[PDB]
PDB file of C-alpha atoms in Angstrom:
ATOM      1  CA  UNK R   4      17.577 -14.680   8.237  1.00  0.00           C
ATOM      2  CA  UNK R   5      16.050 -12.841  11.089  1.00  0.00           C
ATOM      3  CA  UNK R   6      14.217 -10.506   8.922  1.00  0.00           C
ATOM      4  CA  UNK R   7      11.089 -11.032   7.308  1.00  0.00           C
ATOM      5  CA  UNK R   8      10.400  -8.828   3.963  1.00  0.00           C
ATOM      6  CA  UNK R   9       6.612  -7.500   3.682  1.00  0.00           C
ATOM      7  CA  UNK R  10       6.163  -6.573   0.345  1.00  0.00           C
ATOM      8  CA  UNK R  11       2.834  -4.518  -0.268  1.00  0.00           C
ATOM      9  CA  UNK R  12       1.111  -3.356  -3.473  1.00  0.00           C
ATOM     10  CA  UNK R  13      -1.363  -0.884  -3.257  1.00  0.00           C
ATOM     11  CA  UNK R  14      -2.482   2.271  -4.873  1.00  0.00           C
ATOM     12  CA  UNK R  15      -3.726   5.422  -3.104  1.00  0.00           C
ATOM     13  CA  UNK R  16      -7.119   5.813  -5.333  1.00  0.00           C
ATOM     14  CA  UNK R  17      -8.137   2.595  -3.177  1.00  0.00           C
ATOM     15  CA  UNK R  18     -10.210   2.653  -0.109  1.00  0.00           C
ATOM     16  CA  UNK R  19     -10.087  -1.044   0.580  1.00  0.00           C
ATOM     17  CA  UNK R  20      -6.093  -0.453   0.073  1.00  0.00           C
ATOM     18  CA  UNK R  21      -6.184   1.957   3.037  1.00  0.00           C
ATOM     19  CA  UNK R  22      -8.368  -0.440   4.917  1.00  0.00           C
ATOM     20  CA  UNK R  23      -6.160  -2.914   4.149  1.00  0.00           C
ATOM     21  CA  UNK R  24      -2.868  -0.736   5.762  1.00  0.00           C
ATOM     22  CA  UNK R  25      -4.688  -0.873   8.775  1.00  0.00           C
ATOM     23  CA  UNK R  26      -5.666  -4.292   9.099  1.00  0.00           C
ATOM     24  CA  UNK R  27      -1.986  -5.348   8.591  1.00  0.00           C
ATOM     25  CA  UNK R  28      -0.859  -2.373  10.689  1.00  0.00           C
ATOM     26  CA  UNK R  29      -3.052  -4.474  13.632  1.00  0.00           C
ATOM     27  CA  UNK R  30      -1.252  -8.150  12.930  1.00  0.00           C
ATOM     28  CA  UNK R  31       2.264  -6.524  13.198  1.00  0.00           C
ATOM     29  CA  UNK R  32       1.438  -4.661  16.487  1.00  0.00           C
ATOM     30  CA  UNK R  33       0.141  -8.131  17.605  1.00  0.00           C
ATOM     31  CA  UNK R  34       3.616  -9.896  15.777  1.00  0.00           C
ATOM     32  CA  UNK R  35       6.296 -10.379  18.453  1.00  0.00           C
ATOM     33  CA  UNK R  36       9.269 -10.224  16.276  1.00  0.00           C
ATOM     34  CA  UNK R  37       7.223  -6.980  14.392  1.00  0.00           C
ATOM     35  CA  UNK R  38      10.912  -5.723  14.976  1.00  0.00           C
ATOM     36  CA  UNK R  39      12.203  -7.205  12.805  1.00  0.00           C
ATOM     37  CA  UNK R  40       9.635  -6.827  10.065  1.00  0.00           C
ATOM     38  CA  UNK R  41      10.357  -4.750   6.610  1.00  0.00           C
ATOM     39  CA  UNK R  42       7.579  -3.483   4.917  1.00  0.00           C
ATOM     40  CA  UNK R  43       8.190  -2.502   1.342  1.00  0.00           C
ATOM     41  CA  UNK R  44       5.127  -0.547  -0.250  1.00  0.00           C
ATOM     42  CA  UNK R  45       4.945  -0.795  -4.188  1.00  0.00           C
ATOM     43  CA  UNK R  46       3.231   1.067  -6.895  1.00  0.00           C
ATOM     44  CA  UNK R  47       0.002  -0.039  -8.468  1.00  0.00           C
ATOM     45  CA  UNK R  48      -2.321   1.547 -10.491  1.00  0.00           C
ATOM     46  CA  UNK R  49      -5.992   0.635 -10.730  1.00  0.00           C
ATOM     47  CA  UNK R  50      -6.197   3.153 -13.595  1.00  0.00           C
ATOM     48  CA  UNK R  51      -3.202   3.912 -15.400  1.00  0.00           C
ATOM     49  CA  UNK R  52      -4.731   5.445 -18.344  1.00  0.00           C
ATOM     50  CA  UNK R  53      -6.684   7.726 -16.004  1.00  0.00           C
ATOM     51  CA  UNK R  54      -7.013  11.512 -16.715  1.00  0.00           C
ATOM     52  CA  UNK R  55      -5.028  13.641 -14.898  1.00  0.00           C
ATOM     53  CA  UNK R  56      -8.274  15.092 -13.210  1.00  0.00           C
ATOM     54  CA  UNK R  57     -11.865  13.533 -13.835  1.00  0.00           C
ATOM     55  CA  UNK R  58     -14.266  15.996 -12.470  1.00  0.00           C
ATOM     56  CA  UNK R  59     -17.150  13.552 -11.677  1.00  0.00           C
ATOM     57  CA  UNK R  60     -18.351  12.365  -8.726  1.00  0.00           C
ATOM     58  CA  UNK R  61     -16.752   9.061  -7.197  1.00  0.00           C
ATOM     59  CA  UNK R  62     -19.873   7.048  -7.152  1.00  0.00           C
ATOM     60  CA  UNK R  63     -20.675   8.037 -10.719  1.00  0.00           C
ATOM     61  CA  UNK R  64     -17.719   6.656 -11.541  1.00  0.00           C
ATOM     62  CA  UNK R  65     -17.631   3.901  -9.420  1.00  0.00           C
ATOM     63  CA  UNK R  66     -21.184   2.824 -10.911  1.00  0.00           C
ATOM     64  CA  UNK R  67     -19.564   3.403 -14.608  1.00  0.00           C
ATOM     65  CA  UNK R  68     -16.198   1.139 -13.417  1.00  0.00           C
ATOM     66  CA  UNK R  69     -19.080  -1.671 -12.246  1.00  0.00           C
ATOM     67  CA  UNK R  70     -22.359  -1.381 -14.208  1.00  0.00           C
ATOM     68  CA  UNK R  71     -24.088  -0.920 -11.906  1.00  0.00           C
ATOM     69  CA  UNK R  72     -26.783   1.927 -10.450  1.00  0.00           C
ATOM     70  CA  UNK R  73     -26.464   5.020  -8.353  1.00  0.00           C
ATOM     71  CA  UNK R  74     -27.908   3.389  -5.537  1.00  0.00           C
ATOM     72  CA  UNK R  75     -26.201   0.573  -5.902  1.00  0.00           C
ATOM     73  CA  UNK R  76     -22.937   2.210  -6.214  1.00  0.00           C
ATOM     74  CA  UNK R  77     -23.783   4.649  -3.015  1.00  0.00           C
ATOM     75  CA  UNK R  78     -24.616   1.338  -1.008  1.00  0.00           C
ATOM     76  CA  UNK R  79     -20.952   0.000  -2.473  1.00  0.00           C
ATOM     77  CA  UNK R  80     -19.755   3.475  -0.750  1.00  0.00           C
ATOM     78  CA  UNK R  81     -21.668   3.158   2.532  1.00  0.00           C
ATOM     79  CA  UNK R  82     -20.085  -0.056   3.036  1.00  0.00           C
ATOM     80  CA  UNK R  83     -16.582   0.750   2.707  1.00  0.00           C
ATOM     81  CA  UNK R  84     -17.327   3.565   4.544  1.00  0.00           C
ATOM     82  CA  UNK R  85     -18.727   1.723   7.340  1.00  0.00           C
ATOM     83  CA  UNK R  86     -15.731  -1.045   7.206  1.00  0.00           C
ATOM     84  CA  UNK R  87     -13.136   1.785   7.065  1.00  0.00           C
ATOM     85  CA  UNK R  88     -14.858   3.487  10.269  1.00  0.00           C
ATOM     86  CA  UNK R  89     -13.938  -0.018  12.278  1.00  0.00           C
ATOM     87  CA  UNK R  90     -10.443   0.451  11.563  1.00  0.00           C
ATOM     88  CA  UNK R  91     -10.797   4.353  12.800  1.00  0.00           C
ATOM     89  CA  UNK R  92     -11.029   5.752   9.282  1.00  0.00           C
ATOM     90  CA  UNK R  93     -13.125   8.670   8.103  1.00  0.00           C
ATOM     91  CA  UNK R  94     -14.089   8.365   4.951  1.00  0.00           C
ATOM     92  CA  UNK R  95     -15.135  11.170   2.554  1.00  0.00           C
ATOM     93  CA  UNK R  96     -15.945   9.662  -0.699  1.00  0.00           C
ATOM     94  CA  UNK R  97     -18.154  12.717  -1.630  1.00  0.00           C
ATOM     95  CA  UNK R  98     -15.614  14.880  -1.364  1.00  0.00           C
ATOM     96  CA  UNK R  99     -13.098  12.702  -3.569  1.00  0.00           C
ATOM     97  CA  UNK R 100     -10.916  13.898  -6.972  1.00  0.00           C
ATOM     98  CA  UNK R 101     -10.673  11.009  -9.034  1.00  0.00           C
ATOM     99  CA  UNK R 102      -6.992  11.849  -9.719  1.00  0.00           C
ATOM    100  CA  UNK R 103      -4.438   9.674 -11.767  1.00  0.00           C
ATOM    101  CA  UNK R 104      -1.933   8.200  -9.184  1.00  0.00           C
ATOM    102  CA  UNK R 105       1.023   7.986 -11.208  1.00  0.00           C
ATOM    103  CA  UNK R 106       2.797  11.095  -9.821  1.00  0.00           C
ATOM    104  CA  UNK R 107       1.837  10.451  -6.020  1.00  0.00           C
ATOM    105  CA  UNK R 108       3.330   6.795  -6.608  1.00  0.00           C
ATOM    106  CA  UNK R 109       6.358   8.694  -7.510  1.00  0.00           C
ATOM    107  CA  UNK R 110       6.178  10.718  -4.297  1.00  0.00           C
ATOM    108  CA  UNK R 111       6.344   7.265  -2.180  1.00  0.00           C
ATOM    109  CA  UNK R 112       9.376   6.127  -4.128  1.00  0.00           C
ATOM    110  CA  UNK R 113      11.175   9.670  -3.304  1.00  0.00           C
ATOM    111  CA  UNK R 114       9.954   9.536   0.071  1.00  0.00           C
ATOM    112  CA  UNK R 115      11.301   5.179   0.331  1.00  0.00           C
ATOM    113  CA  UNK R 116      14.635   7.169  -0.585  1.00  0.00           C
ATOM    114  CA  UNK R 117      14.746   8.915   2.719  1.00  0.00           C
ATOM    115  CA  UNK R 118      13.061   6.163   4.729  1.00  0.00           C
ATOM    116  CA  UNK R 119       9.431   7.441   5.083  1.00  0.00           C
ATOM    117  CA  UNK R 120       7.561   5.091   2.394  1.00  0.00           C
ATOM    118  CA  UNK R 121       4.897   4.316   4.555  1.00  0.00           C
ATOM    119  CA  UNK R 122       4.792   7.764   6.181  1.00  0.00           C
ATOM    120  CA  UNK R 123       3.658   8.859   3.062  1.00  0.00           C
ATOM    121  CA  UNK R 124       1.957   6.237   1.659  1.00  0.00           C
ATOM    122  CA  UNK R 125      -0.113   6.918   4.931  1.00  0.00           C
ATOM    123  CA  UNK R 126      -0.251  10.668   4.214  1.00  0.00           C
ATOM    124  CA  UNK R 127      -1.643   9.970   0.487  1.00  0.00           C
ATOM    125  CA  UNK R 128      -4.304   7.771   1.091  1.00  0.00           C
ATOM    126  CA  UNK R 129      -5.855  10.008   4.175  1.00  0.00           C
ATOM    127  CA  UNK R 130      -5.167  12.923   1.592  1.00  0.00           C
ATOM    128  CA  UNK R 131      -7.865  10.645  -1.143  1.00  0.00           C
ATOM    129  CA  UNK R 132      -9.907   9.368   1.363  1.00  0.00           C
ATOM    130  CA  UNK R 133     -10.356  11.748   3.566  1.00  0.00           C
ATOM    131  CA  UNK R 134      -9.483  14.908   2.745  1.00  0.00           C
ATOM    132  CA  UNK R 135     -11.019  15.575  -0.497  1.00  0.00           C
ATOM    133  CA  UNK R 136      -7.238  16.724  -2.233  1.00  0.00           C
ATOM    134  CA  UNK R 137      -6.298  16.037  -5.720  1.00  0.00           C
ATOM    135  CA  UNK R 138      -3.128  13.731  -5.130  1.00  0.00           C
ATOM    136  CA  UNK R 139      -2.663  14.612  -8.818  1.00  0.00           C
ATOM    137  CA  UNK R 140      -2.080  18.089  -8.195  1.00  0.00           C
ATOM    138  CA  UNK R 141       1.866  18.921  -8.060  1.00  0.00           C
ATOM    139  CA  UNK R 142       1.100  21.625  -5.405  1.00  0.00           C
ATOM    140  CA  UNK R 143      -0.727  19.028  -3.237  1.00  0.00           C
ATOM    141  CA  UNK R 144       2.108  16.602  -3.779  1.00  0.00           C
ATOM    142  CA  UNK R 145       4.519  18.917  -2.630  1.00  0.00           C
ATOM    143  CA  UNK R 146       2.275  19.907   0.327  1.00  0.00           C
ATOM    144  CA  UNK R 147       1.807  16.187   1.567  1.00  0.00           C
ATOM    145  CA  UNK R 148       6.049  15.786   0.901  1.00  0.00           C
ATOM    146  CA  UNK R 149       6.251  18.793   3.346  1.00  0.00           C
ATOM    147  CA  UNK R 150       3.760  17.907   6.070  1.00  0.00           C
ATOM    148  CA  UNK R 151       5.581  14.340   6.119  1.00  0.00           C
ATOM    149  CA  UNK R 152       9.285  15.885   6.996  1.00  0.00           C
ATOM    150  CA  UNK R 153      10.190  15.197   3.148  1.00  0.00           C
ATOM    151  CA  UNK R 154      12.584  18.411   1.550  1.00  0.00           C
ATOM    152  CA  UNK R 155       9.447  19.983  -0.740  1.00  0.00           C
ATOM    153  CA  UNK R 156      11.323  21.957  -2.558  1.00  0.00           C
ATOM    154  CA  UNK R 157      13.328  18.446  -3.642  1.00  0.00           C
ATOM    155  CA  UNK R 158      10.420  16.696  -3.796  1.00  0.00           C
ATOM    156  CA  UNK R 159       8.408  19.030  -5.955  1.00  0.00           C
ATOM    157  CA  UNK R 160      11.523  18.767  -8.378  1.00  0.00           C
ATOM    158  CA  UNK R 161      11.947  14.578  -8.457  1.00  0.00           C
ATOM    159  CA  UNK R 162       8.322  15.038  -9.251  1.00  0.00           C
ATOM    160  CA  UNK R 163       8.839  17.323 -12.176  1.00  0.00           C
ATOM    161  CA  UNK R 164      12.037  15.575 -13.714  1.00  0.00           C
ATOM    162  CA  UNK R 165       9.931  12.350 -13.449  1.00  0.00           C
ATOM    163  CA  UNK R 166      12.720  10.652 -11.550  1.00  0.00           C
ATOM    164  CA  UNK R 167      10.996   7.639 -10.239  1.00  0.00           C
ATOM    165  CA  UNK R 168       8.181   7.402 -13.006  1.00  0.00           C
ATOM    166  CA  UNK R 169      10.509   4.397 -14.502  1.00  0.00           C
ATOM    167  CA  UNK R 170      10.489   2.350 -11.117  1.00  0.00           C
ATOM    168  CA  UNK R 171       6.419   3.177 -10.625  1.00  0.00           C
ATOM    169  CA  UNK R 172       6.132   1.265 -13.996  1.00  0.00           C
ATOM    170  CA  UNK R 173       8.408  -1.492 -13.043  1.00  0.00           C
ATOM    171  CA  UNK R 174       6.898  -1.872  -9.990  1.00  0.00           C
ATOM    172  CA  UNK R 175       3.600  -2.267 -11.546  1.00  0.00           C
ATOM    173  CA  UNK R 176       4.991  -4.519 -14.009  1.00  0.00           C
ATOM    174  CA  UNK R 177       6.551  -6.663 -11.495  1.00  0.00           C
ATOM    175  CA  UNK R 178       2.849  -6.828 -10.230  1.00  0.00           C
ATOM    176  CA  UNK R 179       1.483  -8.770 -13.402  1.00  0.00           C
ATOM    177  CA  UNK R 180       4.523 -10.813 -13.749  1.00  0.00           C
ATOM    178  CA  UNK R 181       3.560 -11.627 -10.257  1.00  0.00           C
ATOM    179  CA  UNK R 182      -0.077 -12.589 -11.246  1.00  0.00           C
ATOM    180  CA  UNK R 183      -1.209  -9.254  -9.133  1.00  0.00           C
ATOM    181  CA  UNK R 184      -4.907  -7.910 -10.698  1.00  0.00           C
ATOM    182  CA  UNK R 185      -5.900  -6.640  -7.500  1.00  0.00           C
ATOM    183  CA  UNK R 186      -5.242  -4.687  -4.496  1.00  0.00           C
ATOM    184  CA  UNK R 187      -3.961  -4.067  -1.472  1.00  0.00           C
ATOM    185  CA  UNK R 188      -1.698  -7.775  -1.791  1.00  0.00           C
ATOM    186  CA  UNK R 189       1.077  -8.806   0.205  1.00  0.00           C
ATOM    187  CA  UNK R 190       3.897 -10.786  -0.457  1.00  0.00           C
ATOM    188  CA  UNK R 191       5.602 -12.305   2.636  1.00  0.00           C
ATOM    189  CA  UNK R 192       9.602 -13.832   2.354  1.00  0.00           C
ATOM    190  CA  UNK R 193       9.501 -13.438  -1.328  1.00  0.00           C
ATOM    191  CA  UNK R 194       7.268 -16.530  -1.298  1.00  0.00           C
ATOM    192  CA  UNK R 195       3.872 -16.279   0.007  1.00  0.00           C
ATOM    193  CA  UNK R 196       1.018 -13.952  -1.016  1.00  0.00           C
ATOM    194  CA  UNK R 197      -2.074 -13.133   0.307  1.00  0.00           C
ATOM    195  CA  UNK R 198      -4.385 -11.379  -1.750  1.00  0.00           C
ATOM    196  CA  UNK R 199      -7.229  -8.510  -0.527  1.00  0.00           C
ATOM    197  CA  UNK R 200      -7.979  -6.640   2.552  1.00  0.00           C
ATOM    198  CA  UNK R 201      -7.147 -10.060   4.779  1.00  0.00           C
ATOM    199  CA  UNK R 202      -8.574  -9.804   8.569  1.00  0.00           C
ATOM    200  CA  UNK R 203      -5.148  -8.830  11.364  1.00  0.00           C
ATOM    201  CA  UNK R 204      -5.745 -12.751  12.297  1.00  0.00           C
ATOM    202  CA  UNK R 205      -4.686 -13.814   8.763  1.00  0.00           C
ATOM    203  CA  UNK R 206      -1.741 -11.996   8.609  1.00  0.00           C
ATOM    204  CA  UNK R 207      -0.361 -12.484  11.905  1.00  0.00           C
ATOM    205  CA  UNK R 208      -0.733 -16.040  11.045  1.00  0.00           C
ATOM    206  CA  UNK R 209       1.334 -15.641   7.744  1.00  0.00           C
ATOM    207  CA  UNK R 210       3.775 -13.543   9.498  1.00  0.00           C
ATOM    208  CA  UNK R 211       4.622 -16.266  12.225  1.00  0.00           C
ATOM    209  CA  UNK R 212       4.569 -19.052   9.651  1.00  0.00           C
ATOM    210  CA  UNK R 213       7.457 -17.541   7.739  1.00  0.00           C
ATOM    211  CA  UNK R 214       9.226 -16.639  10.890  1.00  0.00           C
ATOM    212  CA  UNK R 215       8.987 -19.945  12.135  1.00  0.00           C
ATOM    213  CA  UNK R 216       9.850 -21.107   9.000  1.00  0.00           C
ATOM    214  CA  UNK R 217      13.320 -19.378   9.041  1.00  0.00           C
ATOM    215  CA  UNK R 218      14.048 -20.664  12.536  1.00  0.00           C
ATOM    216  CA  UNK R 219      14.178 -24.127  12.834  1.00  0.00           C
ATOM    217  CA  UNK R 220      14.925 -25.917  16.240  1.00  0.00           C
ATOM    218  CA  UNK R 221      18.610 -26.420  17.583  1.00  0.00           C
ATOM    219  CA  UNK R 222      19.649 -29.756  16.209  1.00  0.00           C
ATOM    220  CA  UNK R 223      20.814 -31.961  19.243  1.00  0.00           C
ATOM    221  CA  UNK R 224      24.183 -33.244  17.983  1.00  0.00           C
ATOM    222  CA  UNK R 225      25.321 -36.781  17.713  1.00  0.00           C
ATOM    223  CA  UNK R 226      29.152 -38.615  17.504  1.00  0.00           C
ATOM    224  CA  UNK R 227      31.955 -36.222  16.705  1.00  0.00           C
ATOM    225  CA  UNK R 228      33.024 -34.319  13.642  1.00  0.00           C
ATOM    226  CA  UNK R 229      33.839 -36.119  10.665  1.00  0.00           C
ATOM    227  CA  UNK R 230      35.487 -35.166   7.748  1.00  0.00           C
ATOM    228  CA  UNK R 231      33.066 -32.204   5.952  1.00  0.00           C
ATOM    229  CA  UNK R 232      33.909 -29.285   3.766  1.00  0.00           C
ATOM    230  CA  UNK R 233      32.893 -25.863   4.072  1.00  0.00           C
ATOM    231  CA  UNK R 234      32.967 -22.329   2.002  1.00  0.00           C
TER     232      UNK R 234
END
């Protein structure tokens, strides 16, 4: 009606995911109805089958993911680093835990519960990025829960009982139903996508498309009324 639904997948091991936030972030300040925008953030994992802590460095394994060289792999760094530093990021890659994401995702769903997905969404990905934690790290988790306003003692025990791990997974699978093999992507209205880091111009575009969409003009009215039925 006069809501439009932003539905976002993204996981928090993924710098052009973060990069990605912000660019959208930039559209909806520049959106006049951004008021009446709901952004949804869902769970996606580039590496599901990921060790709960691999202790090598992230362009080592970036170069192993790719096949491709150190050098190549740091350049592959530099460059998101440089892109992320337009948006007012500081990147940190040498100081990154490659950490399975599985229990953070879980974290976002308890935190959607109370109303602060994308605080800590947010919170998670400057954590990776930036800040050289292990998001895989049930200590850290409950840390990040804290800092965000979540209940940390709750948190720390959602995390534990694995409450949410069932709608991480069905979140993920509703990402390959979906045709989803890469993020960040957004889904607009339940009908458009738009896959990849887009620039702010793209998706204010898509965002006043759909709104326009669900707001035709006032019909000017001919005759009188004539016999209808209704609900």
């Amino acid at each position: 009606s006069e809501k439009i639904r932003v539905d976002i997948w993204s996981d928090i091991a993924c710098p052009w995911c973060y990069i990605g936030k912000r660019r959208f972030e930039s559209a909806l300040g520049q959106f006049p109805q951004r008021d009446q925008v709901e952004v949804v953030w869902h769970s996606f994992e580039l590496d599901p089958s990921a060790r709960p802590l691999n202790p090598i460095a992230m362009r080592d394994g970036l170069a192993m993911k790719y096949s491709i060289s150190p050098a190549q792999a740091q350049g592959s760094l530099d460059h998101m680093t440089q892109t992320a530093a337009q948006e007012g990021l500081e990147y940190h890659f040498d100081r990154v835990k490659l950490a399975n994401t599985f229990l953070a995702h879980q974290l976002i769903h308890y935190a959607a519960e109370q109303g602060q997905g994308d605080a800590m969404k947010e919170r998670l990905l400057r954590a990776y990025m930036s800040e050289g934690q292990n998001v895989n790290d049930l200590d850290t988790l409950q840390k990040l829960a804290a800092e965000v306003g979540l209940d940390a003692g709750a948190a720390r025990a959602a995390l534990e009982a694995g409450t949410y791990a069932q709608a991480v997974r069905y979140d993920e699978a509703q990402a390959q139903q979906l045709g989803i093999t890469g993020v960040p992507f957004f889904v607009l209205g339940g009908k458009y996508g738009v896959s990849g880091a887009q620039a702010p111009e793209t998706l204010l575009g898509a965002l006043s498309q759909v709104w326009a969409e669900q707001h035709p003009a006032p019909l000017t009215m001919l005759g009188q009324d004539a016999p209808a039925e209704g609900c």
